[PDB]
Design a protein around this ligand. Structure first.
Ligand code: MYR
Length: 192
């Protein structure tokens, strides 16, 4: 699903433990990237610009329906490949199309069961998102949460640190689910 030949997403969770999962991916239709240009900044590290350089098959959209019905605030990601690499993982939190956060992390391949795994586990969620989540769950209606969440996106860029080649670029968009329904995601390919 979320993956190329060179690098696949295996698991992605954001959570709080006193464990509640806001979102969870465990491991496609297309969407015109042009639809979502305005959801990200048009500066350097703009989605149009990234997509221009390519390659196009490295670009995905995840739509998350998140569970805000629930501490340590964490993000855990696991990628895997057959090639030994060092990864630069860049997360950009955007609000009204402006970047308000950039988190840049590095992970070296670890050999395990005949493949390379990259484990970025329990990275502490930045305080902007923690304060944001705390406010967001105070809202008395989901329709209000979704309205606020219309203006909030995440762009994750994963590159080969040694070659600077883009391996993965994922745009995240958000709504809230009911706790009855639980978290859900839909992964799409971005095309142009
Ligand atoms: C460091 O804080 C950056 C983290 C980047 C990924 C965070 C994505 C998960 C956030 C969950 C939010 C749920 C509702 C908006």
């Amino acid at each position: 699903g979320l993956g190329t030949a060179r690098l696949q997403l295996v698991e992605f969770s954001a959570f709080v433990e006193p464990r509640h999962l806001f979102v969870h991916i465990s491991q496609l239709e297309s969407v015109d990237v042009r639809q979502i240009y305005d959801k990200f900044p048009e500066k350097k590290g703009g989605l149009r610009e990234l997509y221009d350089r390519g390659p196009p098959h490295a670009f995905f959209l995840v739509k998350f329906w998140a569970d805000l019905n629930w501490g340590f605030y964490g993000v855990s990601s696991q990628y895997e490949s057959l090639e030994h690499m060092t990864l630069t993982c860049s997360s950009k939190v955007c609000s009204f199309g402006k970047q308000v956060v950039e988190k840049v992390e590095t992970e070296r391949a670890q050999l395990e069961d005949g493949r390379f795994v990259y484990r970025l586990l329990r990275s502490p969620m930045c305080e902007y998102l923690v304060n944001f989540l705390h406010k967001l769950r105070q809202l008395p209606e989901r329709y209000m949460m979704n309205s606020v969440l219309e203006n909030f996106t995440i762009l994750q860029v994963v590159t080969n640190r040694d070659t600077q080649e883009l391996l993965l670029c994922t745009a995240y968009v958000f709504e809230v689910s009911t706790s009855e329904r639980g978290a859900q995601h839909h992964i799409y390919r971005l095309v142009r």
